[PDB]
Symmetry: D2
Subunit: 57 residues, 4 copies
Amino acid sequence: KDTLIVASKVKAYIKSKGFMTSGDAVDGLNEKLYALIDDALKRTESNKRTTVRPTDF
Amino acid sequence: KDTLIVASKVKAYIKSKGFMTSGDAVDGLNEKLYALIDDALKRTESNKRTTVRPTDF
Amino acid sequence: KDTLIVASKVKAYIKSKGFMTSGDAVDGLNEKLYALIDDALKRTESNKRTTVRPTDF
Amino acid sequence: KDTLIVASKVKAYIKSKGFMTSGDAVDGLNEKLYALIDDALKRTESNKRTTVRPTDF
DNA sequence: CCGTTTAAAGCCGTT
DNA sequence: CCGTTTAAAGCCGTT
DNA sequence: CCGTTTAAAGCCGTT
DNA sequence: CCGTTTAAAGCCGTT
DNA sequence: CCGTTTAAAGCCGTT
DNA sequence: CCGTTTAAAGCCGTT
DNA sequence: CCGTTTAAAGCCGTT
DNA sequence: CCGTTTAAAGCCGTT
């Protein structure tokens, strides 16, 4: 639902590597980010934890 | 280098799924995000493109 | 459906790094592999291609 | 080093989805698979475990 | 297939 | 408890 | 065609 | 917001 | 140009 | 292994 | 910033 | 021990 990334920051970085960002690239990256977090929450739970660690991503 | 994600938004979502976020979780997620983008830029280039599309992620 | 990985080869490698493999680890890795390929096929198609390249993974 | 996937099985599946496999696609998929396992071994260790579980992938 | 044994899970008081 | 792996069982042609 | 970005428009307190 | 312009898409004959 | 796949070549015991 | 053929790459004018 | 408190880590005997 | 979050402190224009 909510945007979790800083579009301007992402475009800044992509530009710095000699590339451009499509109108719908950020929405797509945001979908991948949710998938990462949802994957991480399943790893947290399978380790009997309530606290997500960097290693769970 | 730069933070690309909204820590507060990430913690909000993780909380809503009945979990907590570690002090260093967001920095870890930020590393994964860079890896996603760096992977995507290699896909853009291998398709002879300068414009990153959502599909490249 | 079909197993795409060499269980014995995977266990060999995991052992060589000083770790063991759970009874259901390989089935789980096989699920991740399918997800990688299904992701790659969507990248192939979005580039108007029928031939999957290493870069699509 | 070692091939961990069944090239013929992978090509079989990719064919069944209406696509072809490049000469160097399988080597590329094999690299991604190693990256998955190396990622999984770091998750195993950070949970103070020696036994890789499906959830670690 | 099975025995050996290493490793994970369980319990509880501490951080 | 469970994964690893050594060892036993099975099959068949020889002694 | 489309993404980037420069430039114009909008708002308000000053000249 | 909009103009500029770079880049992607389209078409077709070759590899 | 390249990937797919059909077809030819190789090996050996039979006719 | 090799022939067939589908698909990707190349070129250029348009969007 | 800080206090509250939930959760993770530690220890050891069991599976 | 640590993450969450409530509460206190800081800044400034008013009473």
